[PDB]
Design a protein around this ligand. Structure first.
Ligand SMILES: CCCCCCCC/C=C/CCCCCCCC(=O)O[C@H](COC(=O)CCCCCCCCCCCCCCC)COP(=O)(O)OC[C@@H](O)CO
Ligand SMILES: CC(C)CCC[C@@H](C)[C@H]1CC[C@H]2[C@@H]3CC=C4C[C@@H](O)CC[C@]4(C)[C@H]3CC[C@]12C
Ligand SMILES: CCCCCCCCCCCCCCCC(=O)O
Ligand SMILES: CCCCCCCCCC
Lengths: 33, 51, 188
């Protein structure tokens, strides 16, 4: 166990950042021109 | 303001507003089944799998 | 128009993803956790919470449900759960109005979800801001430590669900803005 959640926080932040990157990419693509 | 006009026009639909209330039946015919299906999906998934 | 339709489909898919995230963070209890400097192991969510039994960390008991407000540790927890539930209801209102895209005009439906997603985002922010107020409760203090208190994590550590809720807040804000821009576009 070791009651360590740094890995959980890292992977959660990674997937969240990827999702937000995709959505802001869509927003920027729409907003261009 | 820049990239849109009138602040409100951009953030509301106060333009024009009526007509849609007559087609309220047509809206409801597909609105209510979709809402009930969504409720069933979320309820059953939560109570069977996430618990 | 092709790009507008593709962006609309992507927006709908990301809205459904945000709704899934909202449901998961509401239901799951892994908002706050335990560290090596903790009196006992455990973790508590908005209304649910599990704590260890005996000296051994194994065989931890669980208690709390939204339907039973008698078991929720504090009114702050109750309010946070209520606000997150309101966010769920509003985003599901959008996923229903995806049906209304059939008949009503696209700009109007897009603006309707833009406002509803904004309201869901505000409800989720209010819930996430009100939730830490309840850490002064007796059970939370016993699980975490004496240092724990109002807006003070103390010896406990945040788990994945809380940061996932923050990510959901950001996603809801940006999705609401995207919906507003889509509604104001493709109508001239
Ligand atoms: C797992 C990941 C999720 C995958 C699922 C993705 C879901 C994908 C669908 C998105 C729908 C919204 C997209 C944006 C809609 C943009 C608008 C659009 O596409 O065109 C209109 C609708 O088209 C359309 O068929 C769209 C009609 C709406 C279809 C949606 C039905 C309800 C969806 C219930 C929720 C199910 C999914 C989530 C469940 C958890 C038709 O123009 P049309 O000028 O001819 O009209 C006449 C007009 O002038 C009014 O008189
Ligand atoms: C159709 C739209 C407008 C509204 C749908 C909202 C539905 C999906 C909401 C309203 C009340 C919600 C429930 C409220 C309380 C609980 C108890 C919790 O321990 C698990 C989730 C569960 C069981 C919720 C599941 C989702 C739920 C049923
Ligand atoms: C249990 C299912 C209940 C019924 C679900 C109906 C969903 C389809 C909605 C149809 C709306 C349009 C009906 C009129 C169509 C027409 O012009 O003939
Ligand atoms: C694996 C858990 C999936 C939970 C999905 C809940 C319904 C989402 C409706 C948008």
């Amino acid at each position: 166990d070791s009651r360590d959640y740094s890995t959980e926080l890292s992977v959660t932040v990674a997937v969240g950042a990827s999702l937000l990157f995709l959505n802001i990419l869509a927003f920027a693509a729409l907003y261009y021109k | 303001c820049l990239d849109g006009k009138d602040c409100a026009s951009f953030f509301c639909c106060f333009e024009d507003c009526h007509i849609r209330i007559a087609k309220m039946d047509s809206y409801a015919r597909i609105f209510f089944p979709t809402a009930f299906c969504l409720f069933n999906l979320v309820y059953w998934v939560s109570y069977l799998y996430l618990g | 128009m092709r790009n507008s339709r593709a962006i609309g489909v992507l927006w709908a898919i990301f809205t459904i993803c945000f709704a899934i995230i909202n449901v998961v963070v509401f239901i799951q209890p892994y908002w706050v956790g335990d560290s090596v400097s903790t009196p006992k192991p455990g973790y508590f969510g908005l209304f649910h919470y599990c704590v260890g039994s005996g000296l051994a960390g194994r065989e931890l008991t669980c208690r709390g449900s939204f339907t039973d407000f008698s078991t929720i540790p504090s009114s702050a927890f109750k309010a946070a759960a209520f606000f997150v539930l309101l966010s769920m209801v509003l985003i599901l209102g959008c996923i229903t109005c995806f049906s209304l895209f059939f008949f009503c005009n696209t700009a109007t439906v897009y603006k309707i979800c833009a406002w509803m997603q904004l309201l869901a985002a505000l409800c989720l922010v209010l819930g996430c801001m009100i939730f830490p107020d309840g850490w002064d409760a007796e059970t939370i203090r016993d699980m975490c430590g004496a240092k724990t208190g109002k807006y003070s994590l103390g010896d406990c550590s945040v788990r994945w669900a809380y940061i996932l809720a923050i990510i959901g807040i950001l996603n809801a804000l940006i999705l609401s803005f995207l919906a507003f821009v889509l509604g104001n576009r493709q109508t001239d």
